[PDB]
Amino acid sequence: RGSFVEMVDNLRGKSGQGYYVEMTVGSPPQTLNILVDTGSSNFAVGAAPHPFLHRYYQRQLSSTYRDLRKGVYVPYCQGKWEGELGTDLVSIPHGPNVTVRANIAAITESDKFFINGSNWEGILGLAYAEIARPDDSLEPFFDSLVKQTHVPNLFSLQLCGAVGGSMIIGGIDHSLYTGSLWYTPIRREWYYEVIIVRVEINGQDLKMDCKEYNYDKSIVDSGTTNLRLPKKVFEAAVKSIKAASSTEKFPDGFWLGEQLVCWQAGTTPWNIFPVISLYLMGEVTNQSFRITILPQQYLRPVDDCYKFAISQSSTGTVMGAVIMEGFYVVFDRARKRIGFAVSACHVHDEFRTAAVEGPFVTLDMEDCGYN
Ligand SMILES: O=C(NCCCS)[C@@H]1CN(Cc2ccc(F)cc2)CCN1
Numbered sequence: 088r089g090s091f092v093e094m095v096d097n098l099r100g101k102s103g104q105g106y107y108v109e110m111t112v113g114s115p116p117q118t119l120n121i122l123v124d125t126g127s128s129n130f131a132v133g134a135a136p137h138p139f140l141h142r143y144y145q146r147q148l149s150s151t152y153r154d155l156r157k158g159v160y161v162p163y164c165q166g167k168w169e170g171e172l173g174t175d176l177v178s179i180p181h182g183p184n185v186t187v188r189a190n191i192a193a194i195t196e197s198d199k200f201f202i203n204g205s206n207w208e209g210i211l212g213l214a215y216a217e218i219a220r221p222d223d224s225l226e227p228f229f230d231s232l233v234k235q236t237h238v239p240n241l242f243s244l245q246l247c248g249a250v251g252g253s254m255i256i257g258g259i260d261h262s263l264y265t266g267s268l269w270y271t272p273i274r275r276e277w278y279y280e281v282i283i284v285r286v287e288i289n290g291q292d293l294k295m296d297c298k299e300y301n302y303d304k305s306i307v308d309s310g311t312t313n314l315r316l317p318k319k320v321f322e323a324a325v326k327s328i329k330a331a332s333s334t335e336k337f338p339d340g341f342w343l344g345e346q347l348v349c350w351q352a353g354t355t356p357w358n359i360f361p362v363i364s365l366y367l368m369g370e371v372t373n374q375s376f377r378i379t380i381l382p383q384q385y386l387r388p389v390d391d392c393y394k395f396a397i398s399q400s401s402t403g404t405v406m407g408a409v410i411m412e413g414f415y416v417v418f419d420r421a422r423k424r425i426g427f428a429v430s431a432c433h434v435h436d437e438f439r440t441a442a443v444e445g446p447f448v449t450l451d452m453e454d455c456g457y458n
Pocket residue numbers: 103104105122124163164165200210310311312313
């Protein structure tokens with residue numbers, strides 16, 4: 088019921104390279120840094136000596152390894168990872184005090200997957216069984232843990248920008264947030280699908296159809312760095328963000344994310360940039376709430392230099408790290424909902440803060456969902 092002091096501050100990482108938790112697999116225990124991904128469902132770790140890996144999973148040294156003798160080929164964004172399915176004992180050192188037998192994909196070959204210089208050697212798919220590869224019978228890591236232990240079906244994430252954060256498996260830690268929690272319901276249990284009902288740029292309605300905001304789907308994805316928006320939605324968003332930041336003019340390639348914009352030390356004009364507010368469907372009927380991010384969230388540090396961290400998506404809305412770095416996100420799996428509250432560690436200036444406010448009266452919210 089709080090406070091979960093052991094789990095606090097268990098996530099590490101670098102800007103735009105994902106957040107990883109320390110895990111052990113097999114016996115004797117092999118320590119491996121594993122990226123936290125709520126956009127996938129597969130637990131997959133490096134098993135072959137790839138150039139970018141400092142270390143990997145050695146199946147011959149585990150006396151609790153079991154081969155399933157089944158191959159799997161999984162595509163990611165620009166590349167793909169190909170591996171062999173099996174099972175072993177898994178634990179999280181800075182997590183709950185338990186050990187579980189779980190399905191592990193031993194990554195034997197990968198094309199454009201492992202990031203150079205990054206400290207993680209694997210991926211922890213925390214989404215539901217439906218999108219798990221090869222199919223919906225390969226039980227995802229989190230589902231095993233709940234079934235094999237007394238750990239409640241719930242986990243929360245707090246990603247702090249500049250990089251580190253907290254993954255709390257089993258409960259809600261109060262030291263990690265301020266104000267109140269507002270819950271948007273999960274529509275379907277595959278990705279963590281949510282419904283956006285309205286979008287504002289400095290309190291300026293985009294006047295778009297709410298179904299366009301969720302075109303294909305709207306998901307909360309810890310794996311994804313940037314904030315991703317459908318082609319039509321991305322167009323209007325950049326237009327308004329360009330409109331609000333009129334005072335200074337930026338090269339035309341900056342808005343696509345290809346270019347780098349810089350200012351003198353400290354003198355970063357945060358006030359020139361607008362705030363983005365995403366209204367999400369409430370639990371009550373005809374009720375919603377808005378979540379608000381600052382430029383400190385969508386301008387990613389790389390003189391101080393930043394890259395416009397909002398990109399276009401042909402796969403739907405992806406509320407990635409950019410959105411998540413401003414809040415304390417509770418994935419309340421057992422109650423089919425996702426909670427939002429202002430992050431205690433989120434980056435801000437003296438004059439503006441990230442916000443979560445409600446309730447707001449909104450009609451015809453079901454129509455925002457896509458089929
Ligand atoms: O998701 C991203 N952006 C969308 C790219 C267009 S498909 C990546 C995330 N990446 C870390 C990572 C890498 C592998 C992974 F399985 C999960 C997360 C850092 C760079 N951006």
